[PDB]
Structures are given as structure tokens and as C-alpha cells.
Amino acid sequence: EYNAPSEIKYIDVVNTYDLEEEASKVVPHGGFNYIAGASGDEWTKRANDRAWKHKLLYPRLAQDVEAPDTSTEILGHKIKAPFIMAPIAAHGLAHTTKEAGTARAVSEFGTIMSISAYSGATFEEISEGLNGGPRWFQIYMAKDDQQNRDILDEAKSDGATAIILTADSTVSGNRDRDVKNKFVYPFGMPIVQRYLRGTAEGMSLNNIYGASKQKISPRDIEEIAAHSGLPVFVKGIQHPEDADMAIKRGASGIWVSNHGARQLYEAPGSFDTLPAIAERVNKRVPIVFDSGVRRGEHVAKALASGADVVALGRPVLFGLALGGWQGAYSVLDYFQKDLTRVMQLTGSQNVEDLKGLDLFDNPYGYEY
Amino acid sequence: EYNAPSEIKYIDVVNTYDLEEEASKVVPHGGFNYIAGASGDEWTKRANDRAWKHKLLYPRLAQDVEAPDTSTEILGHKIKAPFIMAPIAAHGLAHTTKEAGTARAVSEFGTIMSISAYSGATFEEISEGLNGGPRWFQIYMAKDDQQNRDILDEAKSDGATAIILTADSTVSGNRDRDVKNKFVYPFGMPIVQRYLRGTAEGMSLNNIYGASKQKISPRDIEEIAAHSGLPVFVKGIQHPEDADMAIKRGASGIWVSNHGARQLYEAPGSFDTLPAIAERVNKRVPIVFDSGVRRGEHVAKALASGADVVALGRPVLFGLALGGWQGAYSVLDYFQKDLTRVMQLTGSQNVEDLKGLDLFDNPYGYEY
Ligand SMILES: Cc1cc2nc3c(=O)[nH]c(=O)nc-3n(C[C@H](O)[C@H](O)[C@H](O)COP(=O)(O)O)c2cc1C
Numbered sequence: 214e215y216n217a218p219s220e221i222k223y224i225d226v227v228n229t230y231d232l233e234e235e236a237s238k239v240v241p242h243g244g245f246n247y248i249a250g251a252s253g254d255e256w257t258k259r260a261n262d263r264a265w266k267h268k269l270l271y272p273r274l275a276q277d278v279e280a281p282d283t284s285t286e287i288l289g290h291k292i293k294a295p296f297i298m299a300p301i302a303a304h305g306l307a308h309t310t311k312e313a314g315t316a317r318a319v320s321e322f323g324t325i326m327s328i329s330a331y332s333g334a335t336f337e338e339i340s341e342g343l344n345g346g347p348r349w350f351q352i353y354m355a356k357d358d359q360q361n362r363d364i365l366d367e368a369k370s371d372g373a374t375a376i377i378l379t380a381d382s383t384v385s386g387n388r389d390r391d392v393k394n395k396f397v398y399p400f401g402m403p404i405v406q407r408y409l410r411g412t413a414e415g416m417s418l419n420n421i422y423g424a425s426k427q428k429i430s431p432r433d434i435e436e437i438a439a440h441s442g443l444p445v446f447v448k449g450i451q452h453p454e455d456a457d458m459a460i461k462r463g464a465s466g467i468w469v470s471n472h473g474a475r476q477l478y479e480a481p482g483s484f485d486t487l488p489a490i491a492e493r494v495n496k497r498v499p500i501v502f503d504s505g506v507r508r509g510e511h512v513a514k515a516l517a518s519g520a521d522v523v524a525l526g527r528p529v530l531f532g533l534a535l536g537g538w539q540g541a542y543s544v545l546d547y548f549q550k551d552l553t554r555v556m557q558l559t560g561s562q563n564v565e566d567l568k569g570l571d572l573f574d575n576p577y578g579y580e581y
Numbered sequence: 582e583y584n585a586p587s588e589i590k591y592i593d594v595v596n597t598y599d600l601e602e603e604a605s606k607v608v609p610h611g612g613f614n615y616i617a618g619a620s621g622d623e624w625t626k627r628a629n630d631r632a633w634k635h636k637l638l639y640p641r642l643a644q645d646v647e648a649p650d651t652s653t654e655i656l657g658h659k660i661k662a663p664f665i666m667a668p669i670a671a672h673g674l675a676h677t678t679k680e681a682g683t684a685r686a687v688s689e690f691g692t693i694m695s696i697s698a699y700s701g702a703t704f705e706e707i708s709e710g711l712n713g714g715p716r717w718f719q720i721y722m723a724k725d726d727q728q729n730r731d732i733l734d735e736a737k738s739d740g741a742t743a744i745i746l747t748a749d750s751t752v753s754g755n756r757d758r759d760v761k762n763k764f765v766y767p768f769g770m771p772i773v774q775r776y777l778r779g780t781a782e783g784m785s786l787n788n789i790y791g792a793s794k795q796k797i798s799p800r801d802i803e804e805i806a807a808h809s810g811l812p813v814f815v816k817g818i819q820h821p822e823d824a825d826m827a828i829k830r831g832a833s834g835i836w837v838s839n840h841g842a843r844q845l846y847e848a849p850g851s852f853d854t855l856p857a858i859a860e861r862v863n864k865r866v867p868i869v870f871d872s873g874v875r876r877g878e879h880v881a882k883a884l885a886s887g888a889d890v891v892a893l894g895r896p897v898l899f900g901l902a903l904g905g906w907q908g909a910y911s912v913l914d915y916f917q918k919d920l921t922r923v924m925q926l927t928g929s930q931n932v933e934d935l936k937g938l939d940l941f942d943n944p945y946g947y948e949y
């Protein structure tokens with residue numbers, strides 16, 4: 214009973230904020246609000262966005278720069294721009310082509326697709342979209358150790374070159390939109406088919422987050438690392454002590470995130486947590502940053518603040534919310550062009566130069 | 582004319598500070614004061630030392646650590662401990678075995694030897710002491726481009742795997758001890774003789790530095806890197822902007838140093854400059870730190886603050902004075918054992934763990 218959009222077209226992206234309102238006049242109310250919403254009254258989602266005004270870019274003059282190069286390398290992948298696709302469940306809420314549609318955009322653009330444990334697409338559907346493109350697999354710890362062995366084997370057979378252990382979701386955030394809407398996922402998770410015992414449709418949202426491992430410990434990071442023989446990112450980190458713990462427990466990367474503000478409420482905007490984590494990590498492993506990236510300036514500010522790449526989420530999905538629809542390859546291309554402008558105006562010839570930018574401290578915050 | 586010590590023996594190093602007074606009993610007065618002294622009234626040499634009290638280590642308990650590993654890697658060299666030998670002129674002022682004695686200690690210990698352009702030993706004599714051990718060559722640039730190509734070609738043919746461009750000595754520091762003692766070198770410098778016309782023997786350091794290039798520019802960093810095809814460190818950096826510049830001009834490493842306080846007077850202690858430089862470098866290239874390292878705690882604090890390795894200077898030369906290669910070796914062994922203790926008490930199993938340490942800010946400074 215779910216009428217997702219199915220039209221395929223390029224979009225002229227002026228900015229990613231307008232993509233949210235664009236789509237809701239076939240684009241189902243409950244699924245839109247599942248994608249767009251966040252915990253509580255969404256103050257921490259607003260914080261993710263307003264945090265970018267805390268540290269401001271300087272234009273830099275006569276820097277001897279032209280035709281900036283956005284390419285970078287992470288864990289042996291050369292990628293077209295320093296952004297990857299974040300792992301997101303249930304892309305079928307946004308478009309009938311679901312994760313296969315996103316994978317084709319990501320692969321055709323030339324970056325890394327992160328595949329959610331809660332994908333609505335089969336791997337063979339996602340694989341058809343990827344057409345050999347690089348992919349990382351995101352897992353939740355299962356209570357059942359055999360389920361963890363089986364899903365790590367699945368990801369490795371499926372050509373994953375890293376595992377993303379999302380650790381910030383041991384229970385659901387207080388997602389008021391989903392509660393008020395009495396939102397139920399309308400389709401299955403053909404990858405985690407080994408846990409929910411009864412039915413997937415008969416479980417709303419509280420019973421599925423509950424279904425996964427709550428008692429994750431550093432030993433789980435050690436055991437994923439040992440079993441997989443792949444680099445493991447720990448995703449959801451906001452406190453520097455968790456970054457040190459994760460690296461000591463064998464993580465190969467730190468993924469700074471608050472899950473798009475969909476988890477803990479009345480927490481900091483994700484960008485505000487990044488410098489303290491980067492200083493603690495002190496180059497030991499690569500850092501991925503997400504939660505609120507909407508502009509080229511945000512990609513630059515994350516790199517200047519210690520991230521190696523950012524991950525994109527909601528703007529890429531925007532095949533849905535509020536008005537008439539937009540989000541895909543056009544969105545990836547927008548971010549690459551947007552970043553190229555920012556590189557030219559900050560004196561940055563290449564992605565390494567972005568990592569050396571000094572930012573202006575704005576103590577007044579958003580209202581200035 | 583100059584009766585340097587010649588005895589070869591191991592020494593029991595309680596601390597490296599006591600080596601200074603002990604070396605003053607065996608090294609002729611002029612040469613001793615050339616090694617020990619610094620600019621002006623030595624306030625910035627004292628600052629180098631007192632800066633270590635600005636950021637204090639925490640003991641950490643129940644950290645599940647035993648038998649810490651001090652090994653690390655820099656620019657594809659596995660080394661026994663995260664310290665290398667700093668390039669120091671004229672080792673024959675300390676011991677008759679001169680740079681060959683230092684080279685033997687460094688290669689026997691298992692780290693990298695840095696060769697001063699103002700060595701009193703030939704590449705051949707140093708090569709014999711190294712017995713295949715890794716070496717980096719420190720250039721004091723000639724004004725003549727062809728002499729630079731020749732020096733660089735000789736160093737690379739001798740087996741250099743990096744070039745160190747020392748840029749902080751375009752003129753001498755105000756070294757009052759050497760002025761008062763009317764210090765002149767008592768022997769020749771075979772590597773740079775080509776541009777001294779005569780011999781370094783009987784020359785002041787003013788006149789030797791005066792022969793090297795004053796008008797060093799970013800183009801010089803580019804041209805050394807292009808000609809050598811070796812990674813180039815820029816040495817003497819204390820301001821983060823020079824780090825950004827050096828990297829944009831093709832440096833493969835930043836070497837944070839104030840030359841052991843022998844150059845600009847009434848400048849900060851070197852360790853106080855490190856964090857700002859590390860934050861600006863932001864992982865782009867490796868950082869070597871020097872100027873005042875005397876204890877294992879100093880090695881740990883440098884790594885915690887963004888350095889990949891430190892370079893050792895005066896203490897090693899004082900060891901050479903007191904025991905030739907075995908005395909110099911005794912000092913390197915002291916630093917390795919000293920660091921191992923500090924790793925155990927800080928909860929550090931390996932060198933990467935040291936990079937993740939938080940330090941206590943001491944705003945009272947030395948007198949507390
Ligand atoms: C609709 C939606 C579903 C998500 N599902 C997952 C998930 O399955 N796995 C996961 O690790 N994170 C998940 N996240 C979090 C994202 O990986 C990412 O952290 C977030 O989208 C970044 O915030 P932004 O999209 O507002 O920039 C989801 C986020 C959204 C918006």
C-alpha cells in the first residue's frame with residue numbers, strides 16, 4: 214500500500230534545502246516524514262544545520278589556484294569528490310527504484326555507496342545499480358553471534374571493502390513525526406532476514422531497533438574486525454573518548470555522526486563535536502563526518518576541521534517530502550560543483566589544501 | 582690543535598641533563614660552549630626546556646597494557662622508537678670518531694641518521710659507521726644551483742631517502758658564548774668545502790652560514806623536491822603559515838624546530854608552537870619535532886601534540902663526547918627505556934596510543 218514516485222529525470226539543483234519541500238503531492242506523507250523527521254522537536258536537527266555558522270570560511274586572494282581538483286583517496290579507493298553516500302534504510306520510501314537507484318547515481322558519479330543492513334532492495338538489485346562500483350556495508354550488532362558471522366560473510370561475498378558498525382541506535386530515537394503518523398515500514402529488509410522471527414510488517418519501529426544488540430561492547434568492535442578481515446568504521450561517535458576506545462578496540466576508521474539527529478535528542482550539532490574528535494584521533498585512522506551536510510561550504514569546513522570525507526544523506530534521498538520532487542545524481546553533481554566554487558574562493562587547488570584552511574570563530578552563533 | 586675525547590665506552594644514563602656538566606669536563610672549552618650554548622642569554626633555550634611543564638601527562642590505571650612497543654614507521658622506514666638523530670654540524674668537536682661514531686650508534690640502535698651539510702666527516706666515513714642504516718641529508722643550500730644539484734646527487738648516491746632543507750639559519754643566531762670565546766672550527770667540512778673557497782678550518786660560523794643561501798624562497802622547496810625525487814622536509818618551522826606554505830610548495834614533511842635555540846632569540850619554546858602547526862598541517866604530511874627533547878615524557882608529549890617522531894640533538898652529542906659510539910648509543914637506549922616506562926604509566930601499548938593522549942593544561946607554567 215505505498216505509492217512511491219517512479220519518474221526518472223535530472224534536476225537543476227539551486228540548493229539542497231529546497232529539495233525537502235519539493236515532492237509531496239504524490240509522495241507519501243508517512244514515508245516523507247519518516248525521511249525528513251528527527252527526534253523530539255528536531256532542535257538537534259536544527260543544531261546540525263546551525264553548527265555550520267559557528268566556524269566561517271575566509272575568502273583567500275591571489276592564491277595561484279585554478280580548476281580545483283575535488284578528487285581524493287580513502288582506504289584504497291580514488292573517488293571523484295570527498296563525499297560518499299551515507300548508509301540509509303528503506304530508499305523505497307523515496308522512489309520505486311529504491312537503493313538500486315541511489316547506487317546507480319553514486320557509481321556513475323564516482324564515489325562509494327554505503328549499504329544499510331535495513332535496505333529494502335536485494336543485494337542483486339543494489340549490485341545491478343552499482344555496476345562494479347565500490348561499496349561499504351553497514352551493520353547493526355545482532356544479539357545472535359551467528360547472525361553477525363552470516364551478515365559479515367554476506368557483505369564480503371557482496372564485494373564490501375569496509376564494514377560500518379552503527380553503534381548509536383541500540384534503541385530508537387524519540388521520532389515524534391513517526392509516532393504522530395503511526396508510521397509502519399511498508400516492505401521488508403531482505404538482508405537482515407534472520408532476526409525478526411515473526412513478521413517485518415507486523416513490527417512498527419520500536420520492536421526492530423529492540424530486535425538488534427543493545428549490549429554492544431568494545432569486544433564487538435574487536436570481533437567484527439577479526440571476523441571480517443575488512444576495515445571497520447564505528448559510526449555514531451560524538452565524544453572523543455569513544456573514538457580513542459574504538460581505535461584501541463581495532464576500528465580502522467571513525468564515523469562522526471548523530472544519525473541525522475534521529476537518535477539522541479538535546480545533543481550537540483554534529484559539526485561542533487568534530488574538532489575534539491579529530492584532535493583525539495590525531496591521524497591514527499580516517500574520519501568520516503556526517504549529519505547536516507547541505508552545501509559545498511559544509512564539505513570544506515568538515516575537511517578543514519579533521520574529516521577525510523563527509524557522507525551525504527537526506528539531500529540525496531530527496532525523492533519525496535512536501536512539494537514536487539528532487540534528489541539523486543543531480544544532487545551529487547551539485548555538491549561537486551558547489552565544492553569546486555568554494556575551493557576556488559578559499560585558495561584551495563586540491564582536497565589536501567582544504568584540510569589546511571583556518572576558519573573564523575563566530576561566538577555569536579546563528580543570529581549573529 | 583683540538584684534543585677531542587677518543588674513549589669508547591657505554592655510560593649509565595640516569596638523566597640527559599647531567600650529561601651536559603659531564604661532557605664539559607672532557608670537551609675542550611671552545612667546542613663545548615659551541616655545542617651547549619644558544620642565542621642571547623639563552624632564555625629561549627630555557628623556554629624550550631620549560632615548555633614541557635605547560636602540558637602535563639596523566640597516569641592512567643587498569644589500561645590492560647604490558648610491555649609497550651616503541652616501534653614506528655616514517656616515510657617507509659621501520660624504526661625502533663619514535664625518535665631520529667637531528668642533523669648536527671661538526672661532531673668532531675665532541676669526539677675524534679666524529680659523525681662516524683654518531684652514525685654507528687644510530688644504526689646500531691635502529692633509527693635514522695640525519696647528516697649535516699656541515700659534517701666534519703666525508704659521506705664515505707659516515708657510510709662506514711652506518712653499515713647500510715637509513716640516512717637523510719640536511720642541506721644548507723649553496724647560492725649556486727649547480728652546487729645544489731651536485732650536493733643532492735652525492736647525498737642520493739650515498740643512499741639518502743629524504744632531504745632536510747634547514748631554512749632557519751640564513752644568518753647566525755647571536756651566540757654570545759661563541760662571540761666571547763672567538764670560536765672557529767678547528768677542522769674542515771668536506772661536503773660544503775666547494776662553496777667556502779679555502780676550508781671551513783679557521784672560519785667562524787657567521788662566514789660559513791654567510792656562504793650558504795640567504796634568499797631561500799618557496800621555489801627552493803619545489804626545486805629540491807623536483808631535482809632529488811626524494812621527500813623534502815622543511816626544518817625550522819615555528820609558525821603554522823610556513824607549514825601550509827611548505828606543503829603547498831611540495832614539502833613531504835614539516836620539521837618543527839628552533840634549531841635548539843641557536844637561531845632567533847626571544848622566540849617561543851619550540852614545544853609551545855607544535856599544536857598550532859599540527860592543527861594547520863592537519864595530517865597532510867608527517868611532522869618531525871625537535872628543540873629541547875631531554876626525557877621520554879617529552880617524546881610522549883610531542884606525539885600526543887601531533888608530532889610523528891622527535892629528533893634528538895645535544896644529549897646524543899654529549900653521549901658521544903663521553904663514550905664515542907657506545908656513549909651516544911647509551912643515550913638512545915636511555916630514551917627508548919624512558920619512553921617505555923612513560924608508555925606503561927600512561928596506558929599506552931604502542932606509539933599510536935601515545936598520539937591519542939590528552940594532556941593536562943598547566944596555566945601556572947614552570948614555577949607552578
Ligand atoms: C531516512 C534515514 C534513514 C537512515 N537509516 C540509517 C541506517 O539504516 N543506517 C545507518 O547507519 N544510519 C542511518 N541513517 C543515518 C545516516 O547514515 C546519516 O548519518 C544521516 O542521514 C546524516 O544526516 P543528514 O542526512 O541530515 O545529513 C538514516 C538517516 C535517514 C535520514
Ligand SMILES: Cc1cc2nc3c(=O)[nH]c(=O)nc-3n(C[C@H](O)[C@H](O)[C@H](O)COP(=O)(O)O)c2cc1C
Pocket residue numbers: 615616617667668669670697698699719747816838839840841842843871872873874893894895896
Ligand atoms: C651543536 C649543534 C649543531 C647543529 N648544527 C646543525 C646543522 O648543521 N644543521 C641543522 O639543520 N641543525 C643543526 N642544529 C640543530 C639541530 O638539528 C636540532 O634542531 C637541535 O639540536 C635540537 O635542539 P636540542 O639538541 O637542544 O634538543 C645544531 C644543533 C646543535 C646543538
